């Protein structure tokens, strides 16, 4: 290590090989040839040698003497070899590889984009989503020389979209999937169309936009083209999405449409979903079990303790009570609600002002006039 620093004795051979071949006058089968035979030699080397002999390949194929009609040939042939190789060590080459394409990316704008997509297919292995993610945004899709295919194009977003919500970050995802929707009309691959329809409706839900979910995913639940098993998977997702949303008329809907599905009869959730179409007041223990039946993202719950479903539970009811009453003091209704009055109040009032709920509070005496 320390007073001899020189590198492998085969790694060498390969670098001087190389080296040799630079200006040669020879055709280009032969001269292609000789090429691919030292990476052949290269490739069959094992370990610091291997990852050694490698480097030099790299840095002899993008430098300048080499015609681009050779390097882009033999980057290529040496790119199909990495897959075969153990992870830490394509992931090392991967990387290496793009930093010393980097000062003429322009030349080698296809050999970027097939190592990106198989260095982000490793951090994808590993569940590195972000890192995945990052290496697949470098690919430049409409900055490059490369006129992508549209499905390329597509296949790709959908890829990051898919990594960031691994991630926990819907936001990015959707930023994403919103690229995608401009394309998808364009492709002519049904398959494709149909997994964007099924990211985007789960980028909404992971974005807690409910309702908009909820119509994506009945409508992936009518698509005969799509297995049974799996539209009744995208009807499920509907129904939860729809009780998990804001209280309203759009809401209130989409309730009705699941109702009369008759597939619905088929979830553990028809129960909820035959009590909030009818404008039932819904309590705690009634909905433990559907609590149980939600996805981890759907679950989240604020510092004071309260969950997206307590929050939409305490919406409907609001909703449901002013069906029923006149008028009712905040005391009655947080009681029959089981919450606390103050809270009756603060969300009444906020419905109100959102336009959700039709009527007026007397803070004073503490009432709220329905209708
Ligand atoms: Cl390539
Ligand atoms: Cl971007
Ligand atoms: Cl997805
Ligand atoms: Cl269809
Ligand atoms: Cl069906
Ligand atoms: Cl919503
Ligand atoms: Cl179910
Ligand atoms: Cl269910
Ligand atoms: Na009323
Ligand atoms: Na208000």
New binding site residues.
């Given amino acids: 290590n320390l007073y001899f620093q020189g590198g492998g004795r085969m790694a060498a051979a390969v670098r001087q090989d190389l080296a040799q071949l630079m200006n040669s006058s020879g055709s280009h089968k032969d001269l292609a040839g000789k090429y691919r035979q030292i990476l052949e030699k290269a490739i069959q080397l094992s370990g610091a040698e291997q990852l050694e002999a490698l480097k030099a390949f790299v840095e002899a194929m993008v430098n300048e003497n080499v015609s681009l009609v050779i390097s882009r040939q033999l980057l290529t042939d040496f790119c199909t070899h990495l897959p075969n190789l153990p992870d830490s060590t394509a992931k090392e080459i991967y990387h290496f590889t793009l930093e010393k394409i980097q000062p003429r990316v322009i030349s080698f704008e296809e050999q970027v984009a097939s190592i990106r997509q198989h260095l982000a297919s490793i951090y994808e292995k590993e569940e590195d989503w972000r890192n995945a993610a990052q290496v697949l945004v470098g690919i430049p899709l409409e900055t490059g020389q490369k006129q992508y295919n549209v499905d390329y194009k597509l296949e790709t977003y959908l890829k990051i979209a898919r990594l960031y919500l691994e991630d926990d970050d819907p936001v990015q995802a959707e930023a994403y999937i919103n690229r995608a929707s401009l394309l998808q009309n364009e492709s002519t691959n049904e398959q494709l169309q149909i997994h964007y329809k099924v990211c985007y409706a789960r980028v909404l839900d992971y974005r807690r936009k409910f309702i908009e979910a909820a119509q994506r995913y009945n409508e992936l639940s009518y698509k005969t083209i799509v297995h049974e098993s799996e539209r009744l998977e995208a009807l499920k997702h509907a129904l939860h999405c729809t009780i998990l949303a804001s209280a309203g008329q759009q809401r209130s809907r989409m309730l009705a449409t699941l109702f009369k599905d008759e597939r619905c009869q088929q979830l553990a959730a028809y129960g909820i979903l035959e009590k909030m179409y009818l404008d039932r007041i819904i309590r705690g223990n009634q909905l433990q079990e559907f609590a149980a039946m939600l996805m981890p993202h759907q679950k989240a719950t604020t510092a004071d303790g309260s969950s997206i479903l307590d929050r939409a539970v305490i919406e409907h009811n609001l909703l449901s009570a002013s069906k029923l009453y006149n008028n009712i003091t905040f005391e009655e209704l947080g009681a029959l609600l089981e919450i606390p009055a103050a809270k009756a109040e603060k969300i009444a009032?906020?419905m109100?002002?959102e336009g959700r709920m039709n009527g007026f509070?007397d803070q004073i005496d503490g009432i709220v006039h329905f209708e």
């Fill in positions: 009032s906020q109100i002002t509070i």
